[PDB]
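Support request, priority: normal
Reporter: lab tech (M.K.)
Component: structure prediction queue

Hi team, I submitted a job for Serine/threonine-protein kinase 4 from Homo sapiens yesterday, and the status page still shows it as pending. I've pasted the exact input below so you can check whether something in the sequence is tripping the parser. The sequence length should be 266 residues. Please let me know if I need to resubmit or if it's stuck on your end.
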Amino acid sequence: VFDVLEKLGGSVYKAIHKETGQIVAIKQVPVESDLQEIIKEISIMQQCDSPHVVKYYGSYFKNTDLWIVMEYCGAGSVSDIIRLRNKTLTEDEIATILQSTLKGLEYLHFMRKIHRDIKAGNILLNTEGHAKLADFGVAGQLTDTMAKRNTVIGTPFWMAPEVIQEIGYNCVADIWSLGITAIEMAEGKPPYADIHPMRAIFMIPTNPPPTFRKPELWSDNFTDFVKQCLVKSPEQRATATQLLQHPFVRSAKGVSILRDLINEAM
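Reply from support: The job had stalled in the queue. We restarted it manually and it finished. Here are the results:
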């Protein structure tokens, strides 16, 4: 049923679906492990149907292992691509990638889900250059009787001020994480990266919004895009829908402009 090839990363494999020839990824996890986040991730992906979100195809038991079958993203994460090439991204490459990422967020947020771990390591590119959100293992779900989440969770440098403070928060926590991700893609690491993450988390609520390390390298469009994402007040912060109309994003080139990037990395 599945013809497993090489190890890409328990662990991840490339495989063919012998009934279609379609390539998939199969994550192998031993059943006797902590499956808490695997369970949450799959429950969230099962509810999603979007070309900007990694798809889940199903699960199997095999010799005391659990095999999870998922959409295959050939180029890997944006973070991998940056390491492989040893180069940060250009304004155009970032505008294209984040346009698709924002369509993913617009979809999730309409569906009442907060990803909670947006960062370059969790945006995946397929070989045609289409970005997809992955890794839903700490995602939150809003409901009728729960209009805010309050769990302090995510990855420290990318966490929104309101997520760190005790107050509840909603989907726009992800928009803060996206601004940090824009900086990470342009500069190679998030603000506060050289300081202890348990120290940085206490600074995030009290400090002014982060800026670019070298403001002179970047256009006014890109500079303004990051400013809007990183508005400290959650109630004032732009939505994903609104940011898709931002001049930095709405004029983004087609995915053809990432062909250099993928080819070089792969």
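The domain at 73-266 is CATH 1.10.510.10 (Transferase(Phosphotransferase); domain 1). Strands lie at 2-7, 11-17, 23-30, 56-62, 65-71, 76-77, 113-114, 123-125, 131-133, 140-141. Let us know if anything else looks off. Ticket resolved.
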